[PDB]
Amino acid sequence: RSVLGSFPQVDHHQAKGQLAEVYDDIHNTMRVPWVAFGIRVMSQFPHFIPHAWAALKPNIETRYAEDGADLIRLNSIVPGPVMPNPTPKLLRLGWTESKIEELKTALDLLNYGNPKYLILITAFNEAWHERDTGGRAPQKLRGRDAERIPYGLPNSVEKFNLLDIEKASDRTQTVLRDIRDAFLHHGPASNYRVLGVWPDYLEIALRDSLAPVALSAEYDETARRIRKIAREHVKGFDKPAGVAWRDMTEKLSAEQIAGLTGLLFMYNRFIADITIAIIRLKQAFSGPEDATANKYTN
Amino acid sequence: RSVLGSFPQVDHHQAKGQLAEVYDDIHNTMRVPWVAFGIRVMSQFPHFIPHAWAALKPNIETRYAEDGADLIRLNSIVPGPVMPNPTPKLLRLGWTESKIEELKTALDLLNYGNPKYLILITAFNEAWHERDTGGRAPQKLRGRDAERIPYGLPNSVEKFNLLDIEKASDRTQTVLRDIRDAFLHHGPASNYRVLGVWPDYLEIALRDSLAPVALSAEYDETARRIRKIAREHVKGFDKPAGVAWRDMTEKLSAEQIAGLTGLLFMYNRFIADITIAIIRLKQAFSGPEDATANKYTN
Secondary structure (H helix, E strand, O other): OOOOOOOOOOOOOOOOOHHHHHHHHHHHHHOOOOOOHHHHHHOOOOOHHHHHHHHHHHHHOEHHHHHHHHHHHHHOOOOOOOOOOOHHHHHHOOOOHHHHHHHHHHHHHHHHHHHHHHHHHHHHHHHHOOOOOOOOOOOOOOHHHHOEOOOOOOOOOOOOOOOOOOOOOHHHHHHHHHHHHHOOOOOOOHHHHHHOOOHHHHHHHHHHHHOOOOOOHHHHHHHHHHHHHHHHHHHHOOOOOOOOHHHHOOOOOHHHHHHHHHHHHHHHHHHHHHHHHHHHHHHHHOOHHHHOOOOOOO | OOOOOOOOOOOHHHOOHHHHHHHHHHHHHHOOOOOOHHHHHHHOOOOHHHHHHHHHHHHHOEHHHHHHHHHHHHOOOOOOOOOOOOHHHHHHOOOOHHHHHHHHHHHHHHHHHHHHHHHHHHHHHHHHOOOOOOOOOOOOOOHHHHOEOOOOOOOOOOOOOOOOOOOOOHHHHHHHHHHHHHOOOOOOOHHHHHHOOOHHHHHHHHHHHHOOOOOOHHHHHHHHHHHHHHHHHHHHOOOOOOOOHHHOOOOOOHHHHHHHHHHHHHHHHHHHHHHHHHHHHHHHHHHHHHHHOOOOOO
């Protein structure tokens, strides 16, 4: 038996018809090279993802929301131990400059997307429990807060290809398991199914950047802070940015509403954790300013 | 539209036959006068509650597991503002000392049980992800540790009846809904379906005790602290105290394995938040030492 199985989810290859249009819409609207592990997972359920998406789209494409994602990114740094650069270790292991740059680009794209997915999940979750995710403030978004960000991926950014966990080496399987378990999580992030093709780096990543802050006051407090930024930000939305489970009782079964309720709560924690995590990795290379910069939609 | 509606679950009365024996064996093994919300909700899935429960049973029934509960209970105090006593307040509403004493007994019972439930949900959540919940330790439980605590509810302890939410007043509904949303939770705890026969108090409770600490660093750190105690404790079990999703694949569809992964995580947080809440609630009547004692299994 594998150290690590594969979690229940509609894979990117599995998304058919109406659903595969949505995965694209997500890519393009959010200018992100992957669909979130949680979206993939929540998509097995009929109706929900497509409907919640349709009600989130108009709100997440704005410069307003992008400014929110920037607040998340900006404050996602952990008041933690100081970390050594991984660069010398990669060179001595014989990595090319060029290869390391490919890693840092990966990290950079990941750190662009995660915070937007923090906005995303906060919308979906809060709306599910009929709490404030839009159309409540007296003052609508005005001036350029309401402008739309560019559609599609940034020039020279392709969609990621996530590694197939079944086919992967023991080494890769294990480091991912380890990173999952260090944080008490359910699965490997899409983040790590991208970063996993470099198990040797992740092993160093885990020892130098993530294991020493995992489960700590400082780390969870930094999750609390960014979740709060996300939760306050979404009330600025012009119209509600998700569906409410009470409006879904013709669409989902009692069992299903249950499942989705837990799934949403879980992913609202997972995404925050992962956001912090990967920024911290790119902090080990460069520093807190470069690591939390918006490098894509300016 | 109703201000709050009932969350989907196998209500106490609805459990038939084999699941009904399970709800009981829970009641009695844990010496608690209510089956947790999270089990009720989670029971609607085939196989899992009965199965996870069979593995928890011999572990949670030991004196060792009772010490576990006591540690959580002891460490559940928030270092927040000092709260006024509500006793004068309830007297001014004409509550008799006798009625007041009825509320405190109920608070004691909720406070007896929430810590044990945190143990339950920790075992279930961890085992599911094949993380450590028993059997890994060098030598087995010995001495006082291995003994079975008493079976059955304590003397003069009657089973609670949850209040019907649908049927309940607007005021019961408002205050419960306010309590749910103040913590970003999914529904009201069994605890509040008990305490909500008394919405005048819950109202005081929220304004005095709960709302000034909801979502604060101190409240959230307290949760981390107690969740940690619980995660370390189940490691001392003689054998695993739950079931792994990988072993359940004949018994559960992908969709449900996903739904449960979520619910498990969500209740692990939920139960911990509530343990702290209801303790806080008693702490205002009678200080920290009282609020955290084991008054039932000594």
